């Protein structure tokens, strides 16, 4: 398993090295999104939490298509503010409940070291 702690001060740095295969080895959920909210990466652990099939959601829009319960000021609101701003680093609790058993999680969003992309990291609380 890949040894990275949820909420770590340098997380963008550590995941920078990591291929889709290395992302699957994390203890928590990880999704890589572009600036428009399209899914670029989606790990096994996020899969175990939500029930989505990872390979199948890559290419879809997280806010419109996959996860419309996050299309809210308290989630997407903050995302788009971070993208406009070019800086983003926030952690909050949320409940995921679209076509699934409602599941409370801790959500951490952060700008990646790349370019114009963004991470969403998820764990159970």
Coordinates of N, CA and C in Angstrom, one line a residue:
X1 N 0.9 -1.2 0.0 CA 0.0 0.0 0.0 C 0.9 1.3 0.0
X2 N 0.4 2.3 -0.7 CA 1.2 3.6 -0.8 C 1.0 4.4 0.5
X3 N 2.1 4.8 1.1 CA 2.1 5.3 2.4 C 2.0 6.8 2.5
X4 N 0.8 7.4 2.5 CA 0.5 8.8 2.5 C -0.6 9.0 3.4
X5 N -0.6 9.9 4.3 CA -1.6 10.2 5.3 C -2.7 11.2 4.8
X6 N -3.9 10.9 5.1 CA -5.0 11.8 4.8 C -4.7 13.2 5.4
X7 N -4.7 14.2 4.6 CA -4.6 15.7 5.0 C -3.2 16.2 5.2
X8 N -2.3 15.5 4.6 CA -0.8 15.8 4.8 C -0.4 17.0 4.1
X9 N 0.5 17.8 4.8 CA 0.8 19.2 4.3 C 1.5 19.3 2.9
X10 N 2.0 18.2 2.4 CA 2.8 18.0 1.2 C 2.2 17.0 0.2
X11 N 0.9 16.8 0.3 CA 0.2 15.7 -0.4 C 0.4 15.8 -1.9
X12 N 0.3 17.0 -2.4 CA 0.4 17.3 -3.9 C 1.7 16.9 -4.4
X13 N 2.7 17.1 -3.5 CA 4.0 16.7 -3.9 C 4.1 15.2 -4.0
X14 N 3.6 14.4 -3.1 CA 3.8 13.0 -3.0 C 3.0 12.3 -4.1
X15 N 1.9 12.8 -4.4 CA 1.1 12.1 -5.4 C 1.5 12.5 -6.8
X16 N 2.3 13.5 -6.9 CA 2.9 13.9 -8.3 C 3.6 12.8 -9.0
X17 N 4.2 11.9 -8.2 CA 4.9 10.8 -8.8 C 4.0 9.7 -9.3
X18 N 2.8 9.7 -8.9 CA 2.0 8.5 -8.9 C 1.1 8.3 -10.1
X19 N 1.3 7.1 -10.8 CA 0.4 6.7 -11.9 C -0.9 6.2 -11.4
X20 N -1.8 5.9 -12.3 CA -3.1 5.3 -11.8 C -3.0 4.1 -11.0
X21 N -1.9 3.4 -11.2 CA -1.7 2.2 -10.5 C -1.2 2.5 -9.1
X22 N -0.4 3.5 -8.9 CA 0.1 3.9 -7.6 C -1.0 4.6 -6.8
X23 N -1.9 5.5 -7.4 CA -3.1 6.0 -6.7 C -4.1 4.9 -6.1
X24 N -4.1 3.7 -6.7 CA -5.0 2.7 -6.2 C -4.5 2.0 -5.0
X25 N -3.3 2.4 -4.6 CA -2.7 1.8 -3.4 C -2.8 2.7 -2.2
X26 N -3.6 3.8 -2.2 CA -3.8 4.7 -1.1 C -4.9 4.2 -0.1
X27 N -4.8 4.7 1.1 CA -5.8 4.3 2.2 C -7.1 5.1 2.1
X28 N -7.2 6.0 1.2 CA -8.3 7.0 1.1 C -8.6 7.2 -0.3
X29 N -9.7 7.9 -0.5 CA -10.2 8.2 -1.8 C -9.5 9.3 -2.4
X30 N -9.1 9.2 -3.7 CA -8.5 10.2 -4.5 C -9.1 10.4 -5.9
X31 N -9.4 11.6 -6.3 CA -10.0 11.9 -7.6 C -9.2 13.1 -8.1
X32 N -8.8 13.1 -9.4 CA -8.1 14.3 -10.0 C -9.1 14.9 -11.0
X33 N -9.3 16.2 -10.8 CA -10.2 16.9 -11.6 C -9.6 18.0 -12.4
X34 N -10.0 18.3 -13.6 CA -9.6 19.5 -14.2 C -10.3 20.7 -13.7
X35 N -10.0 21.9 -14.2 CA -10.7 23.1 -13.9 C -12.1 23.2 -14.2
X36 N -12.6 22.5 -15.2 CA -14.1 22.4 -15.4 C -14.8 21.3 -14.6
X37 N -14.1 20.5 -13.9 CA -14.7 19.5 -13.0 C -14.7 18.1 -13.7
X38 N -14.0 17.9 -14.7 CA -13.9 16.6 -15.4 C -12.9 15.7 -14.6
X39 N -13.3 14.4 -14.6 CA -12.5 13.5 -13.9 C -11.4 13.0 -14.8
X40 N -10.1 13.2 -14.3 CA -9.0 12.7 -14.9 C -8.4 11.5 -14.2
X41 N -8.4 11.4 -12.9 CA -8.2 10.2 -12.2 C -9.2 9.9 -11.1
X42 N -9.4 8.6 -10.8 CA -10.4 8.1 -9.9 C -9.9 6.8 -9.3
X43 N -9.5 6.7 -8.1 CA -8.9 5.5 -7.5 C -9.9 4.5 -6.9
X44 N -9.4 3.3 -6.7 CA -10.0 2.1 -6.2 C -10.7 2.4 -4.9
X45 N -10.0 3.1 -4.0 CA -10.6 3.4 -2.7 C -11.8 4.3 -2.8
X46 N -11.9 5.3 -3.7 CA -13.1 6.1 -4.0 C -14.3 5.2 -4.5
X47 N -13.9 4.4 -5.4 CA -14.7 3.2 -5.8 C -15.3 2.4 -4.7
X48 N -14.5 2.0 -3.7 CA -15.1 1.1 -2.6 C -16.1 2.0 -1.8
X49 N -15.9 3.2 -1.7 CA -16.8 4.1 -0.9 C -18.1 4.4 -1.6
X50 N -18.0 4.8 -2.8 CA -19.2 5.2 -3.6 C -20.0 4.2 -4.4
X51 N -19.4 3.1 -4.6 CA -19.9 2.2 -5.6 C -19.6 2.5 -7.0
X52 N -18.9 3.6 -7.4 CA -18.6 3.8 -8.8 C -17.5 2.9 -9.3
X53 N -17.6 2.6 -10.6 CA -16.5 1.8 -11.3 C -15.4 2.8 -11.8
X54 N -14.2 2.7 -11.2 CA -13.3 3.8 -11.5 C -13.1 4.2 -13.0
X55 N -12.8 3.2 -13.8 CA -12.4 3.4 -15.2 C -13.6 4.1 -15.9
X56 N -14.8 3.7 -15.5 CA -15.9 4.2 -16.2 C -16.3 5.7 -16.0
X57 N -15.8 6.3 -15.0 CA -16.2 7.7 -14.6 C -15.2 8.7 -15.1
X58 N -14.1 8.2 -15.5 CA -13.0 9.0 -16.1 C -13.6 9.5 -17.4
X59 N -13.6 10.8 -17.6 CA -14.2 11.5 -18.7 C -15.5 12.3 -18.4
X60 N -16.2 11.8 -17.4 CA -17.4 12.4 -16.9 C -17.1 13.7 -16.1
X61 N -18.1 14.5 -15.9 CA -18.1 15.7 -15.1 C -18.7 15.4 -13.7
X62 N -17.8 15.6 -12.7 CA -18.1 15.2 -11.3 C -19.4 15.9 -10.8
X63 N -19.5 17.2 -11.2 CA -20.6 18.1 -10.6 C -21.9 17.9 -11.3
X64 N -21.9 17.6 -12.6 CA -23.1 17.6 -13.4 C -23.6 16.2 -13.6
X65 N -22.7 15.3 -13.8 CA -22.9 13.9 -14.2 C -22.8 12.9 -13.0
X66 N -21.6 12.8 -12.4 CA -21.4 11.8 -11.4 C -21.9 12.0 -10.0
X67 N -21.7 13.3 -9.5 CA -21.9 13.6 -8.1 C -22.7 14.8 -8.0
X68 N -24.0 14.8 -8.5 CA -24.7 16.1 -8.4 C -25.1 16.5 -7.1
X69 N -24.9 15.7 -6.1 CA -25.2 16.1 -4.6 C -24.1 17.1 -4.1
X70 N -23.0 17.1 -4.8 CA -21.9 18.1 -4.5 C -22.1 19.3 -5.3
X71 N -23.1 19.4 -6.2 CA -23.4 20.6 -6.9 C -24.2 21.5 -6.0
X72 N -23.5 22.2 -5.2 CA -24.1 23.0 -4.1 C -23.0 24.1 -3.8
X73 N -23.5 25.3 -3.1 CA -22.4 26.2 -2.6 C -21.4 25.6 -1.7
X74 N -21.7 24.6 -0.9 CA -20.8 24.1 0.1 C -19.8 23.1 -0.4
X75 N -19.9 22.7 -1.7 CA -18.9 21.9 -2.2 C -18.4 22.5 -3.5
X76 N -19.2 22.4 -4.6 CA -18.8 23.0 -5.9 C -18.6 24.4 -5.8
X77 N -19.5 25.2 -5.1 CA -19.1 26.5 -4.8 C -17.7 26.8 -4.4
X78 N -17.2 26.0 -3.5 CA -15.8 26.2 -3.0 C -14.8 25.8 -4.1
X79 N -15.0 24.8 -4.8 CA -14.2 24.3 -6.0 C -14.0 25.4 -6.9
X80 N -15.1 26.0 -7.4 CA -15.0 26.9 -8.5 C -14.4 28.2 -8.0
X81 N -14.5 28.5 -6.8 CA -13.9 29.7 -6.2 C -12.3 29.5 -6.2
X82 N -11.9 28.3 -5.9 CA -10.5 27.9 -5.9 C -9.9 27.9 -7.3
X83 N -10.6 27.4 -8.2 CA -10.2 27.5 -9.6 C -10.1 28.9 -10.1
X84 N -11.1 29.7 -9.8 CA -11.0 31.1 -10.3 C -9.8 31.7 -9.7
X85 N -9.4 31.3 -8.5 CA -8.5 32.0 -7.6 C -7.1 31.5 -7.9
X86 N -7.0 30.3 -8.3 CA -5.8 29.6 -8.5 C -5.1 29.1 -7.3
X87 N -5.9 28.8 -6.3 CA -5.5 28.3 -5.1 C -6.7 27.8 -4.3
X88 N -6.5 26.7 -3.6 CA -7.6 25.9 -3.0 C -7.0 24.9 -2.0
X89 N -7.5 24.9 -0.8 CA -7.1 24.0 0.2 C -8.1 24.1 1.3
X90 N -9.0 23.1 1.3 CA -10.1 23.1 2.3 C -10.6 21.8 2.7
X91 N -11.0 21.6 3.9 CA -11.5 20.3 4.3 C -12.7 20.5 5.1
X92 N -13.7 19.7 4.7 CA -14.9 19.7 5.4 C -15.6 18.3 5.4
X93 N -16.6 18.1 6.3 CA -17.4 17.0 6.3 C -18.6 17.1 5.3
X94 N -19.0 16.1 4.6 CA -20.1 16.0 3.8 C -20.8 14.7 3.8
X95 N -22.1 14.7 3.3 CA -22.8 13.4 3.2 C -23.1 13.1 1.7
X96 N -22.6 12.0 1.2 CA -22.8 11.5 -0.1 C -24.0 10.6 -0.1
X97 N -25.1 11.0 -0.9 CA -26.3 10.3 -0.9 C -27.1 10.1 -2.3
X98 N -26.4 10.3 -3.4 CA -27.0 10.0 -4.7 C -26.9 8.6 -5.2
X99 N -28.0 7.9 -5.3 CA -28.1 6.6 -5.7 C -27.3 5.7 -4.8
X100 N -27.3 5.9 -3.5 CA -26.5 5.1 -2.6 C -26.9 5.3 -1.2
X101 N -26.4 4.5 -0.3 CA -26.7 4.6 1.1 C -26.0 5.8 1.5
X102 N -26.7 6.7 2.3 CA -26.0 7.9 2.6 C -24.9 7.6 3.5
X103 N -23.8 8.3 3.2 CA -22.5 8.0 3.7 C -21.8 9.3 4.1
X104 N -21.5 9.6 5.3 CA -20.8 10.7 5.7 C -19.3 10.5 5.5
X105 N -18.6 11.5 5.0 CA -17.2 11.5 4.7 C -16.6 12.7 5.1
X106 N -15.3 12.7 5.2 CA -14.4 13.9 5.2 C -13.7 14.1 3.8
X107 N -13.8 15.3 3.4 CA -13.5 15.7 2.0 C -12.4 16.7 2.1
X108 N -11.3 16.6 1.3 CA -10.3 17.5 1.4 C -10.0 17.8 -0.1
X109 N -10.1 19.1 -0.5 CA -9.7 19.6 -1.8 C -8.5 20.5 -1.8
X110 N -7.7 20.3 -2.8 CA -6.4 20.9 -2.9 C -5.9 21.0 -4.3
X111 N -5.3 22.1 -4.6 CA -4.7 22.3 -5.9 C -3.5 21.4 -6.2
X112 N -3.5 20.7 -7.4 CA -2.3 19.9 -7.6 C -1.1 20.7 -8.1
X113 N 0.0 20.1 -8.2 CA 1.3 20.9 -8.4 C 1.2 21.1 -10.0
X114 N 0.6 20.1 -10.7 CA 0.2 20.4 -12.0 C -0.6 21.6 -12.2
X115 N -0.1 22.4 -13.1 CA -0.9 23.0 -14.2 C -2.2 23.3 -13.6
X116 N -3.3 23.2 -14.5 CA -4.6 23.5 -14.0 C -5.4 22.2 -13.7
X117 N -5.0 21.6 -12.6 CA -5.9 20.5 -12.0 C -5.9 20.4 -10.5
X118 N -6.9 19.7 -10.0 CA -7.3 19.8 -8.6 C -7.6 18.4 -8.1
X119 N -7.2 18.1 -6.9 CA -7.6 16.9 -6.2 C -8.8 17.1 -5.2
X120 N -9.5 16.0 -5.1 CA -10.5 15.8 -4.1 C -10.1 14.5 -3.4
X121 N -9.9 14.5 -2.1 CA -9.5 13.3 -1.4 C -10.6 13.0 -0.4
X122 N -11.0 11.7 -0.3 CA -12.1 11.3 0.6 C -11.9 10.2 1.5
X123 N -12.3 10.3 2.8 CA -12.3 9.3 3.7 C -13.6 9.2 4.5
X124 N -13.8 8.0 5.0 CA -15.0 7.8 5.9 C -14.7 8.4 7.3
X125 N -15.8 9.0 7.8 CA -15.8 9.5 9.2 C -16.9 8.8 10.0

